[PDB]
Amino acid sequence: RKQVSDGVAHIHASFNNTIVTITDRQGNALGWATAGGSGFRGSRKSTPFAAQVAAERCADAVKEYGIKNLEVMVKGPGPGRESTIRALNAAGFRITNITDVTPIPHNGCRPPKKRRV
Template identity: 60%
Template sequence: MTTPATPATPAAPAAPAAAAPSAAPAKGAKRSKKVVESEGIAHISATFNNLLITITDLRGNTLSWGSAGKAGFKGSKKSTPFAATVAAENCGREAMNLGLRRVHVRVQGPGSGRESAIQALASVGLRVASIRDVTPIPHNGCRPPKKRRV
């Protein structure tokens, strides 16, 4: 049994991709400024080899981020306190341009740039409201790496 043929309805012509409104602005166009509350959290992860800093709002949405590698340092220079200072200054400046004024700092890890990163955030103009060490401490968990014999 065959179904009766229905007259074909003309399909609407597809709009060109350039004319369709999209969520991202066109390349080179100005982006609208994010509306940011004045308080946030700076997550500083200081490892032996690098320093990562992420500044979020109080809900956890990332406002800006930086690392010693993003600041232009390579190799063993990434683990220096100076690299941590430069990375934190860049990240803090970017967050202040979005409207952030006060920050709670959460530091994790044993790296050498912990204190210098906090000082850099303060020197940029962010008010440091609190500092918390959130380094995970094992209750006799995994075996640590062997000691180096140099």
Template identity: 60%
Template sequence: MAEATPSPGQQQPQGTPAPGAPAGKTGGKGGRKKTRRGVTRGIAHIKSTFNNTIVTITDMNGEVVAWASAGTVGFKGARKSTPFAAGRAAEAAAAAARKLGMVEVEVRVKGPGAGREQAILQLQHAGLKITSIEDVTPLPHNGCRPPKKRRV
């Protein structure tokens, strides 16, 4: 007996391609991870908040090559906001980017956090050549009212 195509209301069985889909594609989000070999220049985005520091290394088009945060390298709670944790996050992101061939980066720093300088230093110590450093912290032209001061 020939297989009947499901009507629009019926669910497609798992693992079978959708009608009209190319053979070999099962229509999920699975698949191979894209490898980015030979990316030599990039941008290191350092977002340093009062609670955490996130280091994202992208190629020149903005496609993410590697990233790390103080939380992903093992720090929890208040220790995530320390300069040491920011340095470890930068170290981890730089190591991952170097494995993919990254040699030099432009650094863009955003935010008021404590880990800004330490993250930049660790990117340099990890062997990445820093070509420029830019502060891209958004500054309001007297926009929203800031939160009220804490009374402890």
């Protein structure tokens, strides 16, 4: 029901999960996939493979809007930075930018206790 042309892949790479979210150039979200959505719990949720499928499962969900190009913003540490920025290429978009937008405090807020494990 629409055109957009130019979008923005926001990949959010926690340790437990990845969320890819494709959005247009001014913030408004079109589609999203998670690792947990793609049939993966627990150990397998995390992995760089189930980051991939996340990408696809999302590049599938924006045939409708008929995107050609996107920028990739990457927010976080985890596995599926490197994998997910490759599975948006090979599922048939052009990649203009790749950004790292990971929050670093300029010493700010006290984190939680060390784990004893």
